[PDB]
Symmetry: D2
Subunit: 115 residues, 4 copies
């Protein structure tokens, strides 16, 4: 699993469940091509987005559909979504965990990159 996404809810103190996540890869024509997507599990995690073979170096974007999550909870949010844009770089074996902590008017995101 070279790429996983973990989302937490800072209002409820819980995993953020059933959040849609879309991953895009930047293409030569400077456009964003859909790459993978899914919904977070009961643990707020999304595994199995890609494989080591497919996840080559390049620029990627992870869009987390935060507005629809807060709307389901009946809480007015600020952002349309949270966008995490980064370059995947081969420098020995790597696993990328994109973590996001959500509040209605704020989010934080971190990358945990391990061997």
């Amino acid at each position: 699993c070279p790429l996983m996404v973990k989302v937490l809810d800072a209002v409820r103190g819980s995993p953020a469940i059933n959040v849609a996540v879309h991953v895009f890869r930047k293409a030569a024509a400077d456009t964003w091509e859909p790459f993978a997507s899914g919904k977070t599990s009961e643990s707020g995690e999304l595994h199995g987005l890609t494989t080591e073979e497919e996840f080559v170096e390049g620029i990627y974007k992870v869009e987390i559909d935060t507005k629809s999550y807060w709307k389901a909870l009946g809480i007015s949010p600020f952002h349309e979504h949270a966008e995490v844009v980064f370059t995947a770089n081969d420098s020995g074996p790597r696993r990328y965990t994109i973590a996001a902590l959500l509040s209605p008017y704020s989010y934080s995101t971190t990358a945990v990159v391990t061997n």
Copy 2:
């Protein structure tokens, strides 16, 4: 001053100075149109991006060029930029402060919205 951006550096405990910021507005053709740009000051703030007249209702994207900021400080960071996407002025004009707190592998963003 209906739109202000404030950027802080969590490594040095200081304003993040000379950070480039680009603002876009979503146009009718589902494309991002350039709206305003600038660089943060010695206080880590960017004022004067727009006026109440020009800042109509719409979906806006504030792109903070964090990668160039870290690289100039000798750090190879994770993110290409911090992107903040939101609907503005949909219930009438508001004043928006978009704050971002930067670390090499993490950032947080917050909005302070006043009437």
Copy 3:
């Protein structure tokens, strides 16, 4: 104004108003001595806690009463308070801004230190 505290609410996207703040200084007998206190203003800021003369080198604790803030808004939060503990003025006088961003089950704190 060598010590200022700023508190924001990540649920409402607003300053956190009327938040009680207590500052303590560690004394020679390994105890916390009361140093200053106050409440945040309409801008979520608390100024005038101390003077350059009184704010000597030492270990200080800034306790932000977040539980009372959330309870007054109808939320039963996780934390009793947000505690910020730090050594001040050990390399000469500095100006400190202690910022806190609050959510019911999370908070972040940052320091902006200037010469």
Copy 4:
């Protein structure tokens, strides 16, 4: 495992390894009594601090020794430690994960409380 602690490093994008963590329970004399402690693992986690039998309702404090972690890395930090203070409440079965994200001049903490 009713209480675990997870610590991440926002400068390196990694788990924060070998961080000392001390847990205290508030006693009737309004003093903090040592309850449990340990060091985070290679995954930045600390498990096995307490048991369901011992972890009764009360006020607890989790101290994360952030200053010594940054000193080991040769980076000047702001805080002496990060302190997370909360009330444990029995309202059906609960597991508490205290997560902390560290930067030299900032930290965020979240509680993930699950059944």
